[PDB]
Amino acid sequence: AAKEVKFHDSARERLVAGVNLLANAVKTTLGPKGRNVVIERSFGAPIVTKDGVTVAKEIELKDKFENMGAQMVKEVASKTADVAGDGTTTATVLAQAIVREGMKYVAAGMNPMDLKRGIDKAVTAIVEELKAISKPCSTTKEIAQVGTISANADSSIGEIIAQAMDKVGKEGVITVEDGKSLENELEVVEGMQFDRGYLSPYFINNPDKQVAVLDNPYILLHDKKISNIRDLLPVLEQVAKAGRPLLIIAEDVEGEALATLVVNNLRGILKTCAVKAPGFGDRRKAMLQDIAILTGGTVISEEVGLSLEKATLEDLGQAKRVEVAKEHTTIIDGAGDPAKIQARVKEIRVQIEEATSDYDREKLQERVAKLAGGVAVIKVGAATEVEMKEKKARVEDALHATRAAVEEGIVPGGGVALLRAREAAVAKGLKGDNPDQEAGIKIVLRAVEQPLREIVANAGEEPSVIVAKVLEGKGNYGYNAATGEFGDMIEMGVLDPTKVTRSALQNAASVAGLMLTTECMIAEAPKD
Amino acid sequence: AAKEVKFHDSARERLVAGVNLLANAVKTTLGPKGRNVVIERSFGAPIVTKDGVTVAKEIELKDKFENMGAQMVKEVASKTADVAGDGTTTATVLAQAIVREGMKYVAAGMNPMDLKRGIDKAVTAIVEELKAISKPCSTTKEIAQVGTISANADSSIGEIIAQAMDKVGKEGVITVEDGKSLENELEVVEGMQFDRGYLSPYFINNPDKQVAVLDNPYILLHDKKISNIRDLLPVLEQVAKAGRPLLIIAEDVEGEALATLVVNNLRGILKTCAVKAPGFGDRRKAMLQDIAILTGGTVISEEVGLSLEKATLEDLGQAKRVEVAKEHTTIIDGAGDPAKIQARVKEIRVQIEEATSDYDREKLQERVAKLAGGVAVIKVGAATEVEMKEKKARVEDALHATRAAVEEGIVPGGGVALLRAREAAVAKGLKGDNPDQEAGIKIVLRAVEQPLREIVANAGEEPSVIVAKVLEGKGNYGYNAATGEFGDMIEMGVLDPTKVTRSALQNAASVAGLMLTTECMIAEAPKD
Amino acid sequence: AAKEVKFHDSARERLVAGVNLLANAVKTTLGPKGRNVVIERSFGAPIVTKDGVTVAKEIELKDKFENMGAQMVKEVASKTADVAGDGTTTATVLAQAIVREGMKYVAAGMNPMDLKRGIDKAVTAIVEELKAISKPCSTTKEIAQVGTISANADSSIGEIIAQAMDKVGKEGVITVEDGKSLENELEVVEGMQFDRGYLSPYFINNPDKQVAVLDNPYILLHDKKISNIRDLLPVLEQVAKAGRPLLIIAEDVEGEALATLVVNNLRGILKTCAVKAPGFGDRRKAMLQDIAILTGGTVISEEVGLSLEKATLEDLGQAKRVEVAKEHTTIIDGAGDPAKIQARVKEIRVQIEEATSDYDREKLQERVAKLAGGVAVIKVGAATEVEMKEKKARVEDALHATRAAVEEGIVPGGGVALLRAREAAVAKGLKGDNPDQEAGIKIVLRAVEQPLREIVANAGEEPSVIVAKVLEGKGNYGYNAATGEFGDMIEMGVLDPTKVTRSALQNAASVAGLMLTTECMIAEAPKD
């Protein structure tokens, strides 16, 4: 429809007002002494959150020109959440600091394109200094400290995450679900479990658990439905001769085939259990192949030339124990050759880099976890689901930060890392080509102080005095906003993932630099 | 509905007001010191653009009479983007200058139709002088300079585009897509790649990369589905005793045929791979014939008289090497006669001259690139999506300008080319048939100074002083707005494609000349 | 009532908007090619003026915050008109230039109080250089040129004013009144005339022109009413045997005294005339004393000790000729000694410095003109009243400028004087204490170019090109906007009073400097 066009300061003033409104709301949640933000939901039960990205995504302004500024800052938080899962409040605070400091130079008449080029030059220098300052996260104590800090000083969340990563290793998958009790509990699933139950209660061999337990069983992988007994009889006779139990993993076992199994179970002639093949579509085939590789067998399929009638014991997978519950079954550990298992894991991890869908690599990682790792479930305990949603966001934030810690390392928290990186970059000789680029560098140098300033401001102290004292110190020296005292940030456990710090600065600079270079602003005009 | 009618000056002022509003918004982005324009999107994430056509297309005015002026100037940039892909801001600036200068003569009682005839006469003379001033773009250094200027003084974009054109040649195709890293990367695909993967993972011969490499294989081109085995056996036997691998390019290979190929792969009897035929509809037939010509084979089809059962080794295509990945295969080098390949390329380029849809020659050029060239992919690296879109537009603009540079040549940039062409045209005796036509010539003579004036105005200097100094100079002498220094434009790297300059002037003159001849305007009346 | 308070840039943008609105209206009248402004009057007959002060005084804005800015610029023009009577448009233009240039430095974060201090420092230096450039106005040709320029290139007005100043000298008084003809006419009144007619038509001695001429008469000065014949008889008898006529200057001659004079005139016994004493209150006494000093007589008053009954011939004033018309009488030349006349003139000129009212010094100058000079009346000729008012304002401007020219000298016009003074001041080492004061100096250096820029802009040429050419010249070299050519401005007759140029700059700097220091604006809130 009709468009309203704003120029020069009338457009920048509207843009900055939208930037400030969104960032001020996100500001309140920053730091250990940051406070919660309540966001109304259409379906009732307002959410309480301390996450910057959650607050940013819910902000829309009636003024369309102000809304444009808010939408661009919302991009900073959204990108930081996507790439790091943490630091969205820090990224939003940094973006507002760059805009606030950059608009002073834009009003001073300097070329904003050179300011943006100077901003990029300074951010590149500071990010390189962050890499040098960063230290690897090797000890599980550091993992707990990183998780504790990112969970808003919750030691229980940090400890349970450190235990989860210890149990499932680096290749494991950790998820967060609602708990039933009031306390956090960690459930670790070892081996391969594909969450499929038996097709008949008569497969159960012990009533105290209602779980079909098979000791040293054969595993039959089939990619087609099984209904008649004629084709399944030849393999049944072989496993009957051996005496070992048989686990039939196929799309479905019904009619004569299912009936025959339950008869042999009741009379004790042959113990067996049947489960549905996990997953739908091609994912069902992929996990079926993984089970065959893990169990040392081959999936029987006419697409590969194998037939159920001609299937032999060598084509069947093996294990020492599998237990089938009402809705899940776990192969404790397959009998396949570990070299082939490692090769299969290598193939998936190579293909992981090519994954595009967000659910794609998530489902590919659980396959790797099922193969050569474990799956940990952290069940969050809370009295009410409004507290459960708040705690789950904190647990998920701590999981993202701890994952980023093992990837790129850790740096001192409380905004100290940006200050230390800034001083190193300046000492190295950071400079611009023209005075406008030098001003752009000075924008970033002042802006990196903002995360510490807003942390201190939320704590109720004077940001300028604290920042000056921190700059006087060297190394990991910093300010603990939780206790209001200075000290070695690493010793007091205030740790930040360097990936989160680097991502927050890079995302903030890219968007805030563009917002400095705006002269005209076009939005749809109001409906009178 | 009801129409409101405006006459004489009352109509012209409304028309000019719409011209000025659109052109002023586009003005802000002109030159190296031009600034960005933010346009709000309905779905959030406002776009930040420096392109004139992008800004112009989003401008609509509440006043319907002012909207006509905006709509008519808007399509000056639309036509310039269509034919050159660059210079849309220059075209919009030129169109406003002609309207502004022409309205003075219309208000002076001069015949606007003779003004339009004089404008056309002057533009024809200036365009001819642009051809004489233009110099061919031979060196790759000039290509980098042209790309750097069009990417808003970004040497990385200019250098990567120059490398891309060097690798793929004049007949190659270069595309721009999003990157995953923060840096621009160039991926060059040589030979023929048709972005289709294998039909079965068992075709993989090396698990390190999950790829299927066939060395000196036969290629079977089939335009019909393959499902049974009795037809594929005669050609499979012929492939078998030769020892070379076989690549089957058909619509689909399922059932018995797929199983037989998979079975022989595991047993090692005969190594082969099967891929789906690329393309849909008649386009699938076209590239299948191209593959047959490239590989020195014939597509087996009952529509031509060939049969799969009667297919022989001579009918099969050959290549030195082909690799089949999960989603694409690349024929490294076909065995076809280069004379036939050149003839095939000649036929397609003839069809290119006749293509009527935008995707028609685009796919036709892709076929030519697959045959006798290469496909280069520039992955733009940016931290956020908003910066990614802005960078991609700059890379696309630089690609269009470099293509225009090799097509028609280069001229000194910064509005110098129009000034030099104007002086040459005046010195050649440019005159009209009557004083009204002479005024139309004087409109264009003043208008061509506007691109330099607006570049200098955005740079903050005095346009009239700079223009006078530039006119005092000769040849490539000009003003560098980036550095604020006078000098040789070609030596300083400020290069412009002569096609972009010619297209901008011709499109601006055609529309702005018509706008001078308007005496009555008719629009739908407002709803009270 | 309730007050609305604005801060920072919101307050400044409203202040500047009011400044620009008033100055843009005044801009249109600047220079030889400036155009008229029509102002609505409540009682009909709109005034057409080219005066900056007249246009500025009529401008009031609905926005109270914008009105505050307009009221301060209106103050610049009012002060310039008060002290110089010309240069009000130049002062308004200079004030806007300082505000426009100074707002850029205020927006750059510089201290505006130091900007004001730098502005004052630069203006002091430039005014000093204006004194050196200024040359005295000693020739009547220069007076005509100064009057011609200030009358908007009207040679007739300049010539008639030059003639008027020649006739009445430097001590004379020139006034402007409406004329009955279509051409300007100059009426010079020599000697003492106090615009008082005879008391009876029988005093007329020649009916051709209805005037009463007395040759070598005695003058009787009386400060009290004369009604009875008894007191007037002793003096009347004394002048009877002398044979000379008698002029009686008293407040009133009525009753027996008036009748006796009429009877003696009719019978020819004693020729006489009687007039009212000019002026009211103490001004009547002062002018009566001046007449006595001029005529060499004494004022017969009981307040000094003299009595009408004891009045003698030596106490009576004398003159060689006096003529009494219906409403005025002129003493051709008094018989008093020049030494006492000059002493009386010196006393009044000393009192002139002490005058506290505008009419106070105006009437004092009239007394001095009556004593030792002349009174010239310029009757402006015009066809209509609207043209008469426009012409009268131009004549008053030329009168004010010519008076300023003889006081302080003349400088090259067209804004050249400010440019030459700026170059001399910079070459002399004009500098500030701190960089903020240096910026304040740079404000004035750019601002003094504005009068030439707006003169050229009204002429339709390019201001920046002309200014550069003028600056590259030296001395009186400048641009003639009337003829559009460069040359010696003194030779071409474009002259300006250095008092007008100095007053315009000083008044503009004082107000515009304060406007830069604005942070908060308090105005009455709208009444809703």
Ligand SMILES: Nc1ncnc2c1ncn2[C@@H]1O[C@H](COP(=O)(O)OP(=O)(O)O)[C@@H](O)[C@H]1O
């Ligand atoms: N006890 C503490 N003392 C000082 N700083 C702390 C402390 N705990 C956390 N921080 C800092 O606060 C930041 C976490 O605030 P948070 O609201 O999580 O921001 P974000 O979600 O953007 O990471 C971290 O950068 C960390 O350095």
Ligand SMILES: Nc1ncnc2c1ncn2[C@@H]1O[C@H](COP(=O)(O)OP(=O)(O)O)[C@@H](O)[C@H]1O
């Ligand atoms: N450093 C420079 N100095 C002077 N002129 C330049 C410089 N860089 C680019 N230009 C000029 O600016 C113009 C580029 O305008 P641009 O903002 O890209 O819009 P468009 O591409 O629509 O013309 C070109 O004509 C070029 O000649």
Ligand SMILES: Nc1ncnc2c1ncn2[C@@H]1O[C@H](COP(=O)(O)OP(=O)(O)O)[C@@H](O)[C@H]1O
């Ligand atoms: N022929 C001319 N060429 C150039 N400048 C001129 C000419 N005539 C007048 N001027 C300049 O124009 C100014 C007069 O403009 P005017 O509207 O009278 O302004 P103001 O009333 O404020 O003095 C003078 O300063 C004079 O120097």
Ligand SMILES: [Mg+2]
């Ligand atoms: Mg956090």
Ligand SMILES: [Mg+2]
């Ligand atoms: Mg361009």
Ligand SMILES: [Mg+2]
């Ligand atoms: Mg004047």
